[PDB]
Amino acid sequence: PIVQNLQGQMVHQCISPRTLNAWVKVVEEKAFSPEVIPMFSALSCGATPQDLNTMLNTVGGHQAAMQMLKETINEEAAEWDRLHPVHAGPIAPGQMREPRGSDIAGTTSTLQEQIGWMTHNPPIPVGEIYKRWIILGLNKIVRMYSPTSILDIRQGPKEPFRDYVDRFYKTLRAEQASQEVKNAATETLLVQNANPDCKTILKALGPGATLEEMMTACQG
Amino acid sequence: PIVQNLQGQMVHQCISPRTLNAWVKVVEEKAFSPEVIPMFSALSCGATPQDLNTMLNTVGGHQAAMQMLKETINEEAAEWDRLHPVHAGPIAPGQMREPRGSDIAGTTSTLQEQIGWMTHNPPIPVGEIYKRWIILGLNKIVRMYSPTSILDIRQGPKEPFRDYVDRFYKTLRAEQASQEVKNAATETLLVQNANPDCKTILKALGPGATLEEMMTACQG
Amino acid sequence: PIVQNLQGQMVHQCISPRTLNAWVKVVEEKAFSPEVIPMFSALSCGATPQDLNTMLNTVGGHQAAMQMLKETINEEAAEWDRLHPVHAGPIAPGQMREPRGSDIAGTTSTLQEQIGWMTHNPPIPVGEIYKRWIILGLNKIVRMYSPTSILDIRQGPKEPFRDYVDRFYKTLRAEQASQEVKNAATETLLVQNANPDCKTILKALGPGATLEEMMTACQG
Amino acid sequence: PIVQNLQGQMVHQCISPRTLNAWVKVVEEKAFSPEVIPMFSALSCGATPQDLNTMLNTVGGHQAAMQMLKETINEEAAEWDRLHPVHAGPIAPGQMREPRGSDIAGTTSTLQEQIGWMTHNPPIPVGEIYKRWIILGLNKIVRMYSPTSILDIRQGPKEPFRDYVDRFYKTLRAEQASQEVKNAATETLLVQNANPDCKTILKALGPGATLEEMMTACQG
Amino acid sequence: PIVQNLQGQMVHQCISPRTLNAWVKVVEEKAFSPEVIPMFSALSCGATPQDLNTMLNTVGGHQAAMQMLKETINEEAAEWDRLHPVHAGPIAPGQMREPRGSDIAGTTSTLQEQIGWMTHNPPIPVGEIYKRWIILGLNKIVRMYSPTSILDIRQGPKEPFRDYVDRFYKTLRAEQASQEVKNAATETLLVQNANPDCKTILKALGPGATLEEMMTACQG
Amino acid sequence: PIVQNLQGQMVHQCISPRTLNAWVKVVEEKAFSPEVIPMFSALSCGATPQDLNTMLNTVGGHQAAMQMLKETINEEAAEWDRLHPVHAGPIAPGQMREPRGSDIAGTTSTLQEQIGWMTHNPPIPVGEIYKRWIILGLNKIVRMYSPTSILDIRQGPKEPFRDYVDRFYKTLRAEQASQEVKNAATETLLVQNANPDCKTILKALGPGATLEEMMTACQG
């Protein structure tokens, strides 16, 4: 990764074993649950495209998910070349050449070239760009590997309200969509799909009632 | 997080993997017990709004509580905006515009802005403001998810006074309350809820006795 | 905590997760045995009053012990104000204001104010003062939570001497008293409460006999 | 390893114990699965030939594979020697003689030579050259020790398409192949090996479909 | 501990949590086996008397041994005082008064005094002197708590010579002895205590044979 | 150990607890298998003779092996004195006195004297010399504690070839000898001691066939 030495110059450090293991275990333990996106984003903090590939390649199993990931990377990398045409001149001693979509993915870029792009007077972040594509690809995985649909989430007759909401938003979260789509679902289904006993209590508070006001009401 | 390098200048570092694991395991292991708020406040020492969202996003499950936490944060951001006006003047010298309540949340704010706000020569603590909002929501969650009521706590004749006293003060910690209220419950309820054999000993000690004195007297 | 950077200026660092976890586990694993006082004193090395509160607040359970702790802190904090009257003047650019008992406990002091008191040309240690009170409060807990009394410790007929002494001093240690009280007990009870077989052997060595001389004699 | 101190000069450090344990446990736990090559490449970041031999020697068992790894390394060293001639000229100024293929292996090379080669102002990467040779042998070992054949992989009617797709791409990863070959197998074999009910859905999607599209369509 | 910062000046640091856990677990796991003395000597590297007392106080249980350790330390302190006279002269310039035996123990000495003694331009090693006293007591404890006697160790005909040889040398390590005494026991007892079938082989090898030679000869 | 501070001066650091524990566990877990030599060499990286003794003394059990080790050290230390006669003059302010065999073993050398020899303008490495003897002594242990002889290694009738080779070289490795002795064994016994079915296949490839070519042929 590109960390900052005490000299204020962003230097390339080796990806710590602690970081690798943590990434391998979250994938083995938590699989592709929503909390795998934050862990990756945090464990990839300041990573070079090669550091990212390293992490992804350490993922044992889920090779299907990994292929979709490569497909999404290929997709987004094609959006980088269709929006950033290659800019061919000579080579200067001030500036780096124009990065390409494949260069960002680390396929056609070396570590030095990657490192330089991130450590540049006008910095072009190939790491954060690459990481941006990956997290999008993992959102398609979490969406896919989510068996539930928010519509299929209904409160059971003997189910505590806190549990139904935990399930409502667990499904809502995995089903990645606009915050507007996810906000409309709550105001539509959270009370509509509640069991009749608590549902009349919820209707008995008014739509402008917080989730806290809903959940404290249907306690027992 | 915004840590202080040996140069005395507050520099930004990556959230350590250890810190992530600690925050995740204290939520998995302890759930929303009162001792998770201190753990959060400690594990988020000098964290940026992006670091705080990272920790909150790593919390697998409890999505009901997490949405409640978001609602508390939204309320606090609205209050911040009403407390702090938007400013008309255009782009001033070595200065940071005032963060909006959403900027403190990091929903509308870049990490560089966050780092700049925290590292500004007259610092503005966008991360700590957000952390206060988060902690308020955590306190709401703990109180909601605490079944015990201080009035409900009572000492069985078979039960030790010290075991009952643990539960009584655990219930008082679990249920957010003003320190005076907690003292008032401690003054009146603890003896009255205690079993009569222990209670008569407590009455023998009189009002001016340490909890140690009360405990040693009922111990036998 | 207030650690020393390589610049020789005592700087405030964040309490490491390793330190927190270690404190949580010793309390969960070892509870309030005597070895919890050293672990706290060591894990609190260089801690600010807020760092201490953090640790104490992370303690899950034993809330009874925690209330006695607050009581003892309240007691000692009252001894700080009865011996250090508040000293009100203007504010200078050399020196810090006079600390108060509540300020030491972190109740009525911010981290900056705490930090400054510890990092002062004439240093006033609010951390080591606060820690001094806490360890005293934990000595009352270990004393209380010790079910045994040194008088109730007697060597069994089929009990090896090394085991009886381990129990004699295990109880002796938890029963915090003057080293003079604890020295008198040994010279009184260690041999008096030994079983008759070994007891005559001990009497057969003379009072000026080391514990080693006692324990090697009653081997088998 | 050759790490970069805060002086900007690449200095030599000892291979951390954590790094050793990680490399040993990933071989004990994962054996020679494809995910051990990335783990090796990462755990050997900036390693000297002596550090690489250290890791390889710590591998308990798999001695057949290890001897195969040695043979691959020997071949690469012979190829290096034929690529790079031995040089007649005697002992030049601030310069490093060309390493022989055995010197890159570290069999005939001192650690000081290795450190000097890597730290030379025009660096020669003796450790990275050796690491490439090692990784080639590791790839040979993984392919040999992978029982699965991409043609052998087939979807049972009972088996989920996504589970079969995992196996198919795991087998393609386990068996070293050119990326075009792997794409060719993916294009033709994946649908044909899939079970007919899923296969007819895949045929309905047509050639231009994401693996996600294929998977969601056969999912049900 | 007194560690050396990058400024070449020995600075004081806090005893790391890892170091504490290691010292506690090696006592819990290994108790007072001979291998705990090296572990202590290593875990107390460059420790102050306060750090040494911290480690000793963290030892849960074994209070008989701990009191024995205190007695050994008291004896050594008395011997130090008789070796080193108290000095009449009043308060000299950049100099440290001579520590009393109790000061080395840290019973009568402040940590600042300890740090000053160790960091004095002509250093006085109050911590290392105390550590020697502690280690002497530890050796007394190990020898007392070792049941085995080198004369008692003997090889069963069923028992392997190498297993017996392990026990023989373990017993010699467990029982503190002069190196010449241990050599004398090794020279005479090891063959004589060995079983006759192995013993006649040992006699065939003759006096001038390595323990390896003896072992390989009795091995079969 | 003697590590390099950022000032470029090799300074003596304390042996980390992580290093100790790692050495204790590899001996307890892996005993004297061949992979214990690399772990020691790596865990001893940059160690002083006292640091080495510390590690060896932490080894719980295998005291027989430990005595042979002392014997081998005594042997090699005698080769240091028979090749390096003591060189007695005065004491200078440039240079260190001539080291002795016992000084290298740490028996008759202090840490300062050891440290100085390693941190000398003309460096004389007492640590790497001592470590060189130890690893030789452990090669005699691994040889001894290896019950198998390469001659007694034969492929079973229902044994996969990969397993027989793993055993052939596992034994070959533990049986430390010249690489020439170990190379001759392979070309002699690896195919000679194969079961008849695979053996004719191996003979059917020619002696100039790699181990890979052998092992891919006898797959099934």
Ligand SMILES: CC(C)(C#Cc1ccc(-c2ccc(Cl)c3c(NS(C)(=O)=O)nn(CC(F)(F)F)c23)c([C@H](Cc2ccccc2)NC(=O)Cn2nc(C(F)(F)F)c3c2C(F)(F)[C@@H]2C[C@H]32)n1)S(C)(=O)=O
């Ligand atoms: C750092 C990177 C590491 C990141 C991130 C990042 C950036 C900004 C924010 C954010 C903060 C504060 C507010 Cl007030 C809002 C807000 N207000 S609101 C009510 O929509 O109107 N929205 N957002 C989101 C956005 F900023 F994008 F608009 C908000 C956030 C927070 C993180 C957070 C987690 C737990 C508890 C509080 C907050 N929220 C989300 O992540 C989106 N989310 N969605 C859903 C659902 F249930 F609907 F599916 C859920 C969340 C969820 F909050 F996590 C929580 C369990 C429910 N994280 S990473 C890979 O970890 O993400």
Ligand SMILES: CC(C)(C#Cc1ccc(-c2ccc(Cl)c3c(NS(C)(=O)=O)nn(CC(F)(F)F)c23)c([C@H](Cc2ccccc2)NC(=O)Cn2nc(C(F)(F)F)c3c2C(F)(F)[C@@H]2C[C@H]32)n1)S(C)(=O)=O
């Ligand atoms: C660091 C930041 C991380 C913080 C903090 C922070 C700041 C100040 C204090 C504090 C210290 C000393 C005293 Cl004497 C009082 C005192 N005396 S008083 C006015 O008469 O009641 N009050 N306070 C609290 C207040 F600051 F408000 F004054 C005191 C504290 C204390 C520290 C402390 C923990 C455990 C044992 C002793 C002390 N922790 C709490 O008190 C929390 N607690 N709550 C309850 C309730 F009531 F629920 F049962 C109980 C506790 C409890 F102590 F564990 C005990 C079993 C009862 N922590 S953070 C986000 O983690 O908070």
Ligand SMILES: CC(C)(C#Cc1ccc(-c2ccc(Cl)c3c(NS(C)(=O)=O)nn(CC(F)(F)F)c23)c([C@H](Cc2ccccc2)NC(=O)Cn2nc(C(F)(F)F)c3c2C(F)(F)[C@@H]2C[C@H]32)n1)S(C)(=O)=O
């Ligand atoms: C650092 C802070 C972290 C501390 C501390 C600190 C400061 C000084 C001393 C100390 C050292 C050497 C001597 Cl010779 C004496 C001595 N000589 S004597 C025989 O009384 O005349 N007394 N002391 C104590 C004092 F200095 F206070 F006077 C001595 C000590 C030592 C620590 C030590 C532990 C184990 C083995 C040897 C020593 N001893 C105590 O802690 C008090 N103790 N009591 C009792 C009992 F059995 F009686 F209950 C026991 C101890 C005990 F030694 F632990 C041991 C199991 C028995 N620790 S902390 C929170 O960890 O404490």
Ligand SMILES: CC(C)(C#Cc1ccc(-c2ccc(Cl)c3c(NS(C)(=O)=O)nn(CC(F)(F)F)c23)c([C@H](Cc2ccccc2)NC(=O)Cn2nc(C(F)(F)F)c3c2C(F)(F)[C@@H]2C[C@H]32)n1)S(C)(=O)=O
């Ligand atoms: C760091 C060093 C440590 C390295 C490396 C390194 C360099 C570049 C890339 C890479 C990135 C993005 C794209 Cl879009 C492609 C792409 N697209 S393409 C041309 O159409 O196929 N190819 N490559 C690979 C190549 F560089 F060759 F172009 C791509 C990579 C990728 C990173 C990556 C891992 C997982 C998920 C997404 C991405 N890892 C692999 O691909 C390995 N892999 N293999 C196979 C096969 F085929 F066996 F099934 C499969 C994978 C797999 F991705 F896991 C997935 C389930 C299929 N790693 S190291 C020694 O560890 O390697």
Ligand SMILES: CC(C)(C#Cc1ccc(-c2ccc(Cl)c3c(NS(C)(=O)=O)nn(CC(F)(F)F)c23)c([C@H](Cc2ccccc2)NC(=O)Cn2nc(C(F)(F)F)c3c2C(F)(F)[C@@H]2C[C@H]32)n1)S(C)(=O)=O
């Ligand atoms: C670092 C400080 C931390 C230290 C130390 C320190 C200093 C020097 C030495 C040492 C080195 C080499 C040789 Cl050749 C001899 C040698 N040869 S001799 C004169 O003929 O006997 N003697 N010594 C010891 C002495 F220094 F006294 F000379 C030798 C040592 C050695 C190092 C060592 C450990 C294991 C295997 C080889 C070597 N450790 C011990 O010897 C302890 N030991 N004891 C016994 C007894 F007898 F009980 F069975 C046994 C051992 C044993 F080696 F494990 C072996 C199974 C027998 N450690 S510390 C507080 O941990 O000590």
Ligand SMILES: CC(C)(C#Cc1ccc(-c2ccc(Cl)c3c(NS(C)(=O)=O)nn(CC(F)(F)F)c23)c([C@H](Cc2ccccc2)NC(=O)Cn2nc(C(F)(F)F)c3c2C(F)(F)[C@@H]2C[C@H]32)n1)S(C)(=O)=O
């Ligand atoms: C650092 C210190 C820490 C060290 C070391 C060190 C120094 C140099 C070398 C080395 C490297 C490359 C080549 Cl091509 C050859 C080569 N070519 S060859 C085919 O003989 O002609 N020989 N050597 C060895 C030597 F340089 F000494 F000549 C080679 C090595 C490598 C390490 C290595 C381990 C695993 C896989 C590849 C390599 N090999 C050995 O260690 C000796 N070995 N022996 C045997 C057997 F099976 F025969 F018993 C085996 C090995 C073994 F390779 F480990 C492997 C399981 C078989 N390690 S340490 C205490 O860890 O050792």
